[PDB]
Amino acid sequence: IVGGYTCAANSIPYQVSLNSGSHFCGGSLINSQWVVSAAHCYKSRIQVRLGEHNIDVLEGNEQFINAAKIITHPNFNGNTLDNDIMLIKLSSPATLNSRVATVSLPRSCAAAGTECLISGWGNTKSSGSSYPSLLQCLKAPVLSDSSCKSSYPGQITGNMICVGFLEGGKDSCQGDSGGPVVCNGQLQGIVSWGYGCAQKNKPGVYTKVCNYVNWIQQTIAAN
């Protein structure tokens, strides 16, 4: 997250870190036993870390739970990043408390202009690298489809939304992928991709969660 601020500890209780030796993607807890992330974050083994704030230091509220099943959208395309969504079934349910909690799926898609909260442990610089220990937070609005497509000609599908600032300076970045975009208490986006970070007229592009609510339901029903 470029241009954001340090979140209050454990104040984003649905945030998870996906770990394979070290942090590499975020995710969102949507059920005590299910996490949603980006399909490009797939690995065949993943440790899900809940209740995290400082990813480098154990502070006492973390839960470390291995993934039992990892399921990418069957029409995910690694070249266009269309359908960039993945479900993870935890090997046991998380214990829910004030520091580990679920977030709701959307009842409807978010309108342009809706204000959202983005979070993660990704790079905080637009040029160069600074990976933080502490969870970062960012308020940003959903942009209209036309501005989105105008920023990224021929690259935006019906399953993608742009969230951010056309003037640049504030955005998600490498290491934030799979993380949540929460608007009015509903998960509306998943950090997916962009051209650089926080660049002018290149806002972040996010998986449009509201198009996948049925897919998620049916996948869980089969597992």
């Binding site: 942090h23 590499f24 993607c25 980006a38 490009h40 974050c41 690694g78 070249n79 990043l81 960039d84 990704g122 790079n123 160069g128 690298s129 990976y131 990224y152 690259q155 998600s172 970045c173 490498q174 290491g175 934030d176 992928s177 799979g178 950090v191 997916s192 991709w193 962009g194 051209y195 650089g196 970070c197 972040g204 592009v205």
Partner: peptide, 30 residues
């Protein structure tokens, strides 16, 4: 277009499509 996954790298081939291995040995946009 480069996905916002954190990958430590040595060569461009360690990165996903759209990214390059940059000066700090992380995948990113060129």
């Amino acid at each position: 277009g480069c996905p916002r996954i954190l990958i430590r790298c040595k060569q461009d081939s360690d990165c996903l499509a759209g990214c390059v291995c940059t000066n700090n040995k992380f995948c990113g946009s060129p």
